[PDB]
Every structure is written in structure tokens, then in C-alpha cells.
Amino acid sequence: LRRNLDERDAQTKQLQDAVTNVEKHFGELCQIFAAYVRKTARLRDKADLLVNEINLYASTETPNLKQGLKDFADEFAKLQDYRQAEVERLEAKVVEPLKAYGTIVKMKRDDLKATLTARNREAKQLSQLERTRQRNPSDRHVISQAETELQRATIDATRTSRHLEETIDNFEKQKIKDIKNILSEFITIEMLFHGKALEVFTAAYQNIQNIDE
Amino acid sequence: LRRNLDERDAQTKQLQDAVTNVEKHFGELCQIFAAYVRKTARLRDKADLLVNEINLYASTETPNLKQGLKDFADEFAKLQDYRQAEVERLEAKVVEPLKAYGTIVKMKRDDLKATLTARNREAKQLSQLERTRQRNPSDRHVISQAETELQRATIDATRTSRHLEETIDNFEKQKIKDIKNILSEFITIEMLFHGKALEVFTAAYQNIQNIDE
């Protein structure tokens, strides 16, 4: 029935738009997290430049001031190693899992296309059956054959749509697990870095106090 | 005496090179700290983009997942306000004090130039005195006048050099205080930010756990 076909299509469009919504927003988050990683690395570069200049300036100075400056530079350089570990973990645990949704989305689009193909085959077999009844009204045999082929197309379309509903449902379940895990990893990777920074800067504060002024 | 003038000049050259060494290295540190600040701000920009996308994606989602995402975005946005305070303090307490050494260096160069000028005047008055003795060997009056003017130039050069030694000595004392204070401020400003980040990310870890998966 026509009012049922409008409903059936609108419901598949929702599954289609559900895949698109994730493709769009996980993909945007993926680009932003990659840019966040690049900006973290570019900040590490400037911190390296500071380490080098403090060391070079320290090499020109009186002994106690030189030692205090080198000790600071040694601690701060340690912080940039932790920043490098933060960059690598963010690439592996945040950017790469979001990037993998390109392939997940492609597989869902195949399931959606198979459903559209099966429904076109069904609609074609239904129009075939009505035409065959009209051209050969009294040929029970060829009508029965067209009825049998419609029933095959119908159950194949139902089963293809039934599989689609299951894979999209699993896709939504895994979407929630993934976004929880991806943001959790981002939070713990950052927390690890900020905790190490506090350790480093606490010690660096001592090495500056020992500079005899 | 000539061996004394080589010594006297080499010692003023050391004062001159001491001003240059600070000009060069405080100026390099100033440029690097400014670039470090710009890279911190550019990392804040990317974090803002993450806040916006998480909010926009959350506006499309089921109620519990939407709320969990918005709560994360609200906490992380709080972290970028602390990053903005870190940027402002680094500009005011680290970059600006290093930048102020352009003016300090200029004043020391004036003291150095006054010393060179006074020594040229002295050397000229000494050559004048020897010439006057040679052209008027028996004019005790004009010789005595040239001797008196040499003694004025000599004590003026001694006093100008004596003032130079005092201002460079004070300049070295203040250099050590300043570099200790500037690096201490950098360390405490960073420590403050990393401590606030730990607070924010600890709370953000809860808001992610409440997402029903």
C-alpha cells in the first residue's frame, strides 16, 4: 500500500541519514583532533628552541648562573619528551580511531544500496506481475510463475532490509562505545601529560631558586 | 703607559661585550617566548574548534549522549579560559620584561659612549700638551695651562669610567635577578595552568563515564 511505502522509505532514509550524521561529525572531529595534534607538536618545537637558547646563553655565563640555567633547560627538555609521547598517543588513540569510520561508513552504505536494489527488483516484479495478468488473463501457468517470482523478490527485500536494520543498530551501539572510548582516551592522555608537566615544573622551580642572585 | 692602555681598553671591551651578550641572548629569549605564546594561543584556537564541533554534534544526538557530550564540551571550554589567562600572564610577566632590555641596553651604551668620548678628549689633550711643550719650550704659562687642561680631562675620564663600572655592575646584578624572576614566573604560570587542566580533565572524565553505552 502506498501509505506504507512512504513510511518504509522515510524509515530507510532515517538509517541513511544516521550513517551520514556520523560520517559528517566523526569526520569533522577527526580533522580537528589532527589539527590539535599538529598545534601541540608546533608548540613542542618552540619549547625546543627555548631549551637550545637557554643552553647556549648558559654556556656564556658565570658558573652558578650557568649551572642553574642548564638545570632548568634539562628539566624543560624532559617535558618536551612527554609532549612527544602525548602527540603519539593522540594520533594512535584519538585521530586514528575516528579516521577508521570512513571504512565503517562505506560498509553501511553498501548495506543501504543492497536494500535499495532489492526494493527496485521487487517493484519491477510487481509491475511485471500486473502486466502479465493483463496480457494473459487466462494463462494460469505464466501468472503463477510471475506470482512466485514476486514472492521471491519480496522475501529477499524483507531479508535485505532486516539485515540493514541489524547492522545499523550495531553501528549505533558501536558508535556510542567508540565516542566514549575516544574522548576518554583523549582525556587520560592529556591528564597524563599535565601530571608529568606539574612534576617537571615543580623540580624546575628548585633549580631556579639555587641561582645565587 | 702603552701596556696600561691596552689593558684599560680590553677591560672596557669586556663591559661592552657584557652588554652585547645580554642584548643578544635576552632578545633571542624574548622572540622565542613570544612565539611560544603565539603557539599556545593557536592551540587554544583548535581546542575552541573542538568545543564547537562537540556541541554541534551533540545537538543531533539522543538525550543521554547529547548531555554527556555537552558536559564534556563545557568543561573543556573552561580549560581554554585558563589557557587564555596563561597567555596573558606569559605576555605580561615573561615576554614584556625581556623586551624591556632594549631600553636598558641603550642606556648602558650611552654610558659606554661617554667613556669613549672622555678618553678621546684626554688623549687629544695629552697630544696637545706635548705639542705645546715642543712649540713653546720656555713659555711656562701656556705649558701650565695645557697641563691643567690635561688634568681636567684625565679626572673627567676616570670619573666617567668609574661611573660606567658602577652601572655595568648594577646591570649584571639586575640581570641575574631578572632572569631568575622571569624564568620563575614562566614556571609558576605554567604550573598554574597544568594544575587547572588536571582539575578540568578529572571532572571531564566523569561526564564521559555517565554516557550510557
Numbering used by the authors:
A (entry chain A), B (entry chain A): 2 to 214
Quoted from the paper:
In this study, employing biochemical and structural biology approaches, we demonstrated that the BAR domain of mouse FAM92A forms a dimer and resolved its crystal structure at 2.2 Å resolution. The structure was solved by molecular replacement, employing the AlphaFold2-predicted model as a search template. Each monomer consists of three extended α-helices connected by loops, featuring a characteristic kink in α2 (residues 160–170) induced by the conserved Pro167. Like other BAR domains, the FAM92A BAR domain adopts an antiparallel dimeric arrangement, with the two monomers oriented oppositely along their long axes, forming a symmetric, crescent-shaped structure stabilized by a crystallographic twofold rotation axis. This dimerization buries an extensive interface of ∼2700 Å2. The interface can be broadly divided into two distinct regions: interface 1, on the convex surface, involves antiparallel α3 helices, whereas interface 2, on the concave surface, comprises antiparallel α1 helices. The analysis reveals a distinct charge distribution: the concave surface is predominantly positively charged, whereas the convex surface exhibits a negative charge. The most intense positive potential is located centrally, contributed by positively charged residues (R108, K109, R112, R114, and K116) from the dimer-forming α1 helices (denoted as region 1). Consistent with previous studies and the established properties of BAR domains, a substantial fraction of WT FAM92A BAR is cosedimented with brain liposomes, confirming its membrane-binding capability. In line with our aforementioned analysis, mutating the residues in region 1 (R108, K109, R112, R114, and K116) reduced the amount of copelleted protein by approximately 90% compared with WT, underscoring the critical role of this central region in lipid binding. Mutating L120 to the negatively charged glutamic acid, together with I257 to the polar glutamine, abolished dimer formation, as shown by SEC–MALS analysis.
FAM92A (family with sequence similarity 92A), a classical BAR protein, regulates ciliary assembly, mitochondrial ultrastructure, and neuronal membrane dynamics, yet its molecular mechanisms remain elusive. FAM92A (also known as BARMR1 or CIBAR1), first cloned from human testis, is a gene encoding a BAR domain–containing protein and belongs to the FAM92 (family with sequence similarity 92) family alongside FAM92B (CIBAR2). Mouse FAM92A possesses a central BAR domain (amino acids 70–283) flanked by unstructured regions at both the N and C termini. In ciliogenesis, FAM92A plays a critical role through its interaction with Chibby1 (CBY1).
